[model samples]
Target chain A: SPPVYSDISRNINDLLNKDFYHATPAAFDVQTTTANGIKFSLKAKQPVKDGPLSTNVEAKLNDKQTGLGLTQGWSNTNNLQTKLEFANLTPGLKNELITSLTPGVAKSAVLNTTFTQPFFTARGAFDLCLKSPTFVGDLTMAHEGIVGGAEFGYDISAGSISRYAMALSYFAKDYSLGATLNNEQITTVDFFQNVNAFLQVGAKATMNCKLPNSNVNIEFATRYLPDASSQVKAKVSDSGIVTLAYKQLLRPGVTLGVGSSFDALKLSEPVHKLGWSLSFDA
Target chain B: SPPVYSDISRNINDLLNKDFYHATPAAFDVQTTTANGIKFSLKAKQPVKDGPLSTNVEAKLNDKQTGLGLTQGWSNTNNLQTKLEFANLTPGLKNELITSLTPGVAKSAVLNTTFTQPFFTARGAFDLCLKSPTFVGDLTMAHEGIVGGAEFGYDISAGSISRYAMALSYFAKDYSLGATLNNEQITTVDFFQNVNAFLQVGAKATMNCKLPNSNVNIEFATRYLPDASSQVKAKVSDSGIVTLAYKQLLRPGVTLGVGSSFDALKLSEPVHKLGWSLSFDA
Candidate 1:
């Protein structure tokens, strides 16, 4: 099977984004959409005392392979968003369009499309804001268990390449390894291991090609699940930053999460970014 | 009814100790006593890297209110412990004896007894090692939801009062308050409030009467339970220490606990005190 360009590093990205809790914030969430069989959701998050209170509301409709969604949120300002998605518009092609309208600001939109075959996948996204809108494309192919992909972006207005990246990955039964070289003159390597049924470990390292003497940035993470409903994760970086996170299903529809981050070199500082979250569903 | 001296501040102590996670440590524990129906247990705890590892094993026998126990553990040295308890030795009296024998060290033992009546309760503990051992006693009485207690310690060998404390408390349907004045000239006041079915809050403050200019040490704690199986607790002290803890029953007999402590003033320090615990039973 073929994967889109973004999926090339999905093995690494998923492990880093979903399992790590270092940057998570303390929040309370309640969803009645699922309880009442509606397609609506509301969420509010406040990460700091006297900090910005960001909130959003979303409503969606789905039928077969077509879906539509509307979102409204407040961050630095106010905005309304709309998204349309179509799966298998053609035999093996899918398309999506996203637009945002902010008060006192210009309207912006983007179109994305993907085509997939048995051994090849391609995707392209185009900005619809400027006179000469920018475009980005990704192509990926897989043979046996080895996969390779390339991503490039171009801005018609500036006439120069906006971004470029290439990645190679190998997938196996118990382990997966990958490397990527981006336009930033940096190379990143990631490894994931399923140590056993109860334990998993992963690591990522990045180094600048131009600075041979500089230290390589490295991070290590581990997950331990003694039972099906509970999990614990810990992550540490080369710069002495450490983070820990835990999640558990309290009951059929209740969940709890806790996370914290600390700098190992400085023990004298108070308030080392501790967070807790509670979620409820009917 | 009457309560024990230790139970006088229980409303405050329980909130501070059980709900807060500041001093909790990372550790692993396993028990097979319940699974196999044996009156035995094993536990080990290690709070820091390269730190001392503490472990203990205990076996016990019980019939009615009579119990005998044997315990062995390691700390700075090796020790074996024995305990004997008798409930209702008399119509209203209970007694217990505890002894510890450590290699290369003198034996130590203590005897404790308590008498309870409709409106009065008294407890006494005696050191059994010295020719004229020290004795400590507590007396408490309650009427119409108001309670008062006094505690005193005496060293018979030195023929002097070693310690003394007095406490007064009021219990109500939705709130409880208490104050204590101890031999050290420090006065402590505690309050507990049941905000609602899902929320509870408590606070404690201690002040030195002799040094009126010094700041009063105050701490606030809160507990939130969104569902029966999950709970979140947070605590903060005037000295800039904040702690958070979460506990949940992952399944019928499986539980997970997470805790973290941070210093508000030391953001540059790495490695905040973070801890996790898992428990299981058949």
Candidate 2:
């Protein structure tokens, strides 16, 4: 079927006009290695709270060249990587948790786990990757638990919230394009209060233009959330990103890159915020 | 005046039965300790994905404790505390990034900025605490920004979606009862691209029985989603969840708990695969 931009646009429209607002912030980072085999990367973010009492923080570290041999060309590449994430919120911020703790407030702690593996393809443009994750958490001083008869409780278990994604890209002299698709699932041990089983399908397309001395990148992607039950109507949505970047050779083994984007555009009600990002890569 | 549960219930009924379906799964935690005479705590949440391939992560850290203590009654106490928090999301997951990269996938990143602040609070039952969130995400993504550009892009956002909620319960001794109200907004980001919205609501109640040697708990919750827009009119729906659990001491420092739940019980439709969970604490 022809990829429809109209559906994507409609989804974005709905999000932008809807009144439900999210108070949480988000963060992540991506890095690739050089021909010689040295790796470095950094990721961090702060919370987006509506009031002084509502706050949060996060950080992450990644090194790509340690275990996997940095391979060049269309063949032979394998590597192992790990990611750690942390977040915190104030007491009595969410209305439900607040009401549950009435005479008190609620607090939380989380530990996230991630792993990734990649396989080389006959053509570098076509490669396969596998990723997996396990999440564990604790809701402390919860007035509602097995003891309090409330919804909150202590849990420690891991399941496969993992998937496989494939990508295919082609570079024709001055123009390059790439497409990717991913299939994944997530399951929690004892918390069936919300969703217990999840299935996800995602697709992305990227186009790059090399102009004389600079490069422009445009990407489009979509995800489908299937209905878990006949009574529950699931939604399918999409997002688009465009980045205009410049790369300059600084020295023998170094290069500096800068870029900006019209980052988050949605086609759904209660649309999300729109912003830009700046990056310095060497 | 006491909040009216009927109005909320009616609103939810109309939304779920006529509008689109939306579901969210989140895990949060908090930990705190008292050092000398000062106490501090931290809370956080794991990443959130709208459906599949789209994962949004947040990073925030906070620290604070009580500065003064006041006695409220013979058994109750009051305390004044100061706290601070900071937050941010991955560049790609920000509202702008989602919209620009995918065109439209998020309604809004409720909190997108790196928030920093100091908040003070008073503790007591039936008490009131006031808060002022320094930043409020702009709704431009759904309203003016996307709506105004419908001619240039297709509107794919869900239209105005609302939520209604109510709960009723009876407590035994230290038992507790309550309900939840969640109103969402659904719409297309663009004005002429088919703008629409619906309201959803749910009602729940729980009871706790504290026996001389063990504790027993039971709960019931239900929700409805109504049609409002053409795309969402077929999505009208309703569901319910029932849970039962028991907790008792197994050893000096350990406790044993077990529970099960029947989820996705459709009031207007047929459902299968009821979910359940079990656990132990020490």
Candidate 3:
């Protein structure tokens, strides 16, 4: 089977990177591009593991004295991360059976598939796909050839997040670049019920450079995002980012990439970040 | 000045069985005793530094699923630690003018004391202690030749502790044991907006064994601690600790000690600690 992006386990390290990507300190005049895929990962660490969790809450008050009533805003978070295993069986499923199962049932069935590889990748070649909310429905053809792809996914839950993204990618030798567009819809039902849909046409470019004994890749891209909202009158904002990476191949299936990104140029809130990513293909 | 505790630092290290002491894991137990103004201590540390802070809230159902009420409770913390640094600073500050300073500031002043003695010794030695918020104080006493000592201490914002202890001790070439009686007074402002005072008595027993090129110590004690609000309801808690340490004399005035403590007989909460103390007497 041609190595469909989904056929490969989303890099456990890659997922870690993605999970903490936004946590990177913002940068200026930087760009970064990354590949997306499902992953299967199980890790048990003894003696040495990730650091402990931490949290902080702050409230801004109007008056210092009286400790009385005042406009206040607070944010609190608790990170309770446990040793967990994530396996992506979508690529290993039988195309006919997967196509026939409901999304709910398919989620559970895919989760039940374990560390077995041959059984997980029996679907031949899997592409980045988006399916409508239906037991069995026609999958939208956003992009084909695994070269240029876009997906619009929304969560049907409280404070839902609807995201639409498009990308143009090219692969030559051991290097690849992709550009993406993103649109976000955020809705809140509280003291003020509102639905804010903003169209942010952003582009992301990725490159994987394979060195002789190491894979050193440099990725850079920028996006011009214009915020579209009716309730809050705000001007459109644009952001740009660039990233440089050096990836060392520790083993046949593992590549570790350490890089940094610079985002937003000459803006009030310029962001710069340093990060590391690892990818493993099976 | 005579070295009342031969190879004192090495003795402390021998009590701890580990090469290095990291932070504690969950719980902590500590016990300390002094002889000839030689102070010994134990500590424990748990990495609460990395954990999510959580709060438990009692929810009241106003109408089963539609209406709810919330009551705040305690906040869960991850990194918790109890640190104790025991020192025979008597031989450190005998006849020093800075010794008159308050315990909080005395440490800094003594650090600058210009004593020509290789090691100073005095029956009157002081200890600076801090334990969470409820307790923070200094203990100082002058020991009489006849096993009689007077102690003065203060804690919290207004709580004062005073005690006079008398006990006979036995000393041999390789082993020594001692006991002391303690009388304490605790006073504080209650939540009911009233001043409260409590009287309590406690006792402690300590034993030290001189090992070849090392030292080991064990301490057992109990305190009748009055409830935060009620002086009448004093709770007697039993505390015991075993410290296995190895000490090496690096030079005449320099020594290193490494060891561990089986505090509270809780193996899961054992404290791995390292200590170094130096003495020079003229």
Candidate 4:
């Protein structure tokens, strides 16, 4: 299978998106697993300066290739959501359904199905709501390490393609390079490299053709693993924000993470953000 | 760790050197594993036009991360060789000793040691015959997905560095690209890509700086696996030779491979080389 659509540039995306807690506000997290294969997690976060504390709770149960999960307490407990997944329904097929259960909120449900093969992968997702349902689909194909993909979203009620995008990527064992065009207006290029056993680096550039006056958004990130149990990550964006994070395994099933971010151009400001997280599992 | 020196271009090497049964002469192979963790293998090969078959027998015993192996029957049973390997004697260190046992032959022994770390790898090999010992060493290091390495051979008897080479490579998860300069005379470039789950392709070019009148040699190869049990390979070289091979798992523990090579410029010639191999393992 081209595996999955995101896999084409997963390495680069991971470098740019993962473990960058410093860019965010303060957060604390806890996770645990039960003997019966159930897992639970809780997160408390302060999203902005003097912002009220927010809490999230999630529970998951999975075994024998199927799983169910529920999450709530986003902003408030009334924002509950659940997911049901069927994995490997066939040799290369997967299906998942997600639903929002908030009573007074606009109820919504979506179903996603994906099929993968060695050279090709495709996914289709559609709103479960019968009235004015919208569909999204994507296809990715690869040959000799070069990958190309296309995606589109259609609103059935509107009878038109609402969004469309295309992407191309090249990957080697230790690095990734890719580009994307979205809605025929935004272009993004990505590069990631596994420099060595201990170092990873990546860069991304995004430009919107519709906004010629706006400069391209460029970001760079890197991670270093000095030893088996610890990692250091850092990132810088064109917006003058620099972020740094360190994650370490405190013990066999315990982890500690801390991060900080500040405006590089305004280092004298007192608005630097700091975050920390600890988790235990058994 | 740079891991091992060979890993830098191992992907391209595998594409150019491995599973191309069609270019090789006919051979039969057998392998077996004992309950005590011993392995035995035998191979009979017809290496030339109407040449007599040659057989090699090897036995290996390995456990707890260390191994010993002996091989015999190159030309005759009087030729024998043994290798003893010490693995992980220290973190990221390995040592191997190899000796030729034929008394009538130029009896020789060599010791090889390798050390690997997250960003660096080095290997050294020296002849045990102190009277005229020769040493070969190589070092490879990587940073941000780019790797560079150097190697040298020293002839202690001559008191000179007889050989030296340098190489550079860039790798991603599904592709590899590299170049090498040898003895400051020959240059080589390699590229390999894992286009998809079932297809792999690679190309290589080599040129000699000392031979201006000679044309650069270039070779291209590709392999495709339609399923888990069968594979097809094809290769072409600047020498006008095109080779094709097919390999299949005939049964749970048996495999069959067949290949043919012909001069593309003179396909009518009866000098085409053909080969086949059968192997059994238990």
Candidate 5:
């Protein structure tokens, strides 16, 4: 089968029309090595949806002579499951296949694959599930602080499931503007400006040519980070969906954030959804 | 009461039948739209009660390198929000209709429609909000991936309140994973007879990997409800969440670790959780 694109900002249509400089969180890392020159490190994401977790590790075996590194992912869901990438090098491939190694049958299975490539400011790639072969691909070019590209896709099962997309985006100082044309129609546009040194604002408007008579689609997202230690971000769409979050670097090896989503541009008893995240390295 | 099932593991039948070694994120994406696809993205979701925030996008006509989409959804509040979807399909076929345009209401609106399809995978999908015609749905296939499905609801005149839900997860291979079981059964009566949402049921899964070990960490956690201990009406769902981890940090750059969940914590008039971490460039 195929994979679904989750992040809205990651839609290929936005390949060119996209954000160049996004927000940041403090870096909390821990690494240790043996005489073998095999570098081991741990990682975590600031926005921890599940828990105080970052189960990713990169083990680069340095031969001292070859100075080459073969990175194997050390994320074992259980005491089992091993994923060792053997380099499909079409390197710029899409829908990366992740292989998991267990000790039994089907213990080593290749599930999906994602490949993105970059060269002298030009980048693009495709992704696919080895089991089902669902695909998404894009070609983007960037220079002079500008990014523009084309994206396309297909469903082996969905015969007519296909599309063509083109997008353009430019980064200036701390601001960005982007737009995408799909199947040849102008479908959307977005803009962001860092009006204040401490705050950044984003506005996105989507067109509904299908309902020119209706559809007032618009959204906004803002983030404020003072030092390398804290950040506050909130996004709200016209549909009245709101998300407000805050992140703080309580210290060097630890960072945490708390945030919530609400449904109340119309309700006084706003329904709230609160979640928290933490990143640590020790 | 509040809900729990944040961990993908929670949903597994290992609590019935499931895995130990699961899938990875990097290998899961490669199935979606095109780069040159005519991207008419009609976005909308099942209706909710509050205002309007539709979160479904119908990007049919994803060919000819052109696009023209039109979608409008009402995102609302119910107390709890929900999103549904409507579409037209090629009857039993994969994606015979390259166009996901919902018919009348939206072209492929009330018909059978899927913006995309699963190629070789036995993909099973079921999502519908008991709200308006808005849509906000997500999928975390293989359970190994992050679950991003969110369904919310509010009220209207309450003319039509439907229901939809079905879920069951398990594991077999050493790599245990698959996902979701949810529903929004709009029941009871309002002035209807003072209506209260019938049941906002959901069960999610989470994974844990040991941190310190060359492995990773996570704790198996669970809870009952906003089920307040004394709120007898709802019953307090204890912090069925517990942290457990182990590691296989093979000498130097090698690694391996494991984790599980629990409902092991209780309020002891607990007031402090000032966690700590230390990092220095010695």
Candidate 6:
């Protein structure tokens, strides 16, 4: 009531530009606490609330102490996160270490004992998720914040795109540039920068195919804070999709955020879609 | 950040406990306050993340000045809350009195209004809920503490046990109890007693069928708390189904809870269910 939700809800403004402005479900995660640099956390979300009602959990242990940990709660489908951590080591030794880690070994030898096979995954397919509209967030050991990390994932059902992904990114005070590779192939490079405390700009290039052609997708996005309590966001992509959104806190602790997207070139009869979300935090 | 998520996530704990070891979707409702005693609040949950998300709001205004108030969140969907609160007062004298005190024919005409179809109902369904588990909470004007209230609901869709319930509960120094009736019949009676700051025990009985017969189902439940962070709970119904659960906080805000239900006297291999949930609050 005293002009407070404004400051907090400003973060909600990101909901407008996030996910290209068409808000889909992002992950529901939170960092619980940190002890002597040892952080504890949880990540959970219902895979398909109506389809199967499966609640997924990823323990994401990164005890800072051992430099690695384990996770659970997403077991209906196993995501054996193999975090390849190579800071003081060579990418060659890192590769060998990643290839040698097996599920049983990771579970019994690492998870069961002191060597955490993965406080972060080093071998499977993994990517850094874009931050969410909700400002409440984080993760620890598995993926070092500034130092960066790699990941590996396996699907137990049958034959799959078993992957080994490692990303190279420089974490500056306000800007970040990174290239991500899947199975040793660079398919995406993303750059994000905060121009000021309230404004941020980001761009990403995604190669749908392995060729060097203009058929790939490129996106450019920017977020502007109108004030401490409300926001406006814009995103335009090479594929012709354009997104714009707005968010504001209607009452103290009550936030309203939403936006829409459209095929920019087809304004005559553009295919447009709307996405929005409102949260009332006590 | 804004003491924002702080309030929202705290309510989340109940969503953690009320489901009682079951980590399934539950209502996330709360009470808001305004000194006018006409506190407004919000009740919401994502029904379908992508479908047309529509929001339902209740003003929850309890103009405390008037002893009578109303609510919306759990309105049984039929509050047509027609509080038919009529006491003997002369319409002749009332009209004469109103006409004498009018700023025009407006007050007398309106105050002398429709025989007032409903001003109270049209006003509020709002009040803050008691903060639970922590034993710290709030509410104002509209609702009462001990001399409870009544509620009646119709299955919004169809084919169901339409309800008509009223309860009287109290918050004492360390103990509480209540008798509840539904559809003009006493169907459930519950009470809770806190023995000390760290220990407590409580019980309840519910009549599944208001009619007296062997085919009529009934249930009994009890809960035991060894301390603020640990508990053991059990429930048994005449239908040969029984449930038991345990919960403990491994750390200050890290909680682990689990429950199981079985056909106590069904088949040799009874149908049983197990549920478990753990939560950590920083």
The better candidate by lDDT, 1 or 2, is: 1
| TM (chain A) per model | 0.90, 0.20, 0.26, 0.89, 0.59, 0.51
- B239, model 3: CA deviation in Å? 16
Candidate 2, B157-184: lDDT as tens digits: 3232222222332222322222332222
TM-score (all chains, Cα) for each model: 0.59, 0.19, 0.28, 0.49, 0.38, 0.39
Over the stretch A40-121, how does candidate 4's per-residue lDDT look in tens digits? 5555555653444455556566776443343332223345578776664475567777887654557788889888678889
Q: Which residue runs of candidate 2 sit more than 4 Å off their true CA positions?
A: A1-282, B1-56, B63-102, B105-241, B244-260, B263-282
Cα displacement (angstroms), candidate 2, residue A120, comes to: 41
Candidate 5's C-alpha lDDT?
Answer: 0.39
Model 3: per-residue Cα lDDT over A76-129, one tens digit each: 122212122222334333221122223333222111112224212112212212
Q: Which model, 3 or 4, shows the larger TM-score?
A: 4
Regions of model 3 farther than 4 Å from truth: A5-170, A178-282, B1-94, B99-122, B125-181, B184-282
Give the winner by DockQ: 1
iRMS of every model, one decimal?
9.5, 21.3, 11.8, 30.5, 19.7, 13.6
Docking band of candidate 2: incorrect
How do the candidates score on chain B by TM-score?
0.89, 0.22, 0.26, 0.92, 0.18, 0.42
Best by TM-score: 1
Tell me what fraction of the real C-alpha contacts between chains A and B each candidate also makes. 0.08, 0.00, 0.00, 0.00, 0.07, 0.00
Give the per-residue lDDT of model 3 (tens digit) for B83-120: 22222344334232122223234222221121223232
How far off is model 2, as Cα RMSD? Answer: 30.6
What is the C-alpha lDDT profile of model 4 across B139-159, one tens digit per residue?
A: 998887898888999998898
CAPRI class assigned to model 3: incorrect
Could you tell me how far off, in angstroms, the CA of residue A250 lies in candidate 5 after the best superposition? 1.9
Q: What's the lDDT for residue B182 in model 6?
A: 62
* Candidate with the larger lDDT of 3 and 6: 6
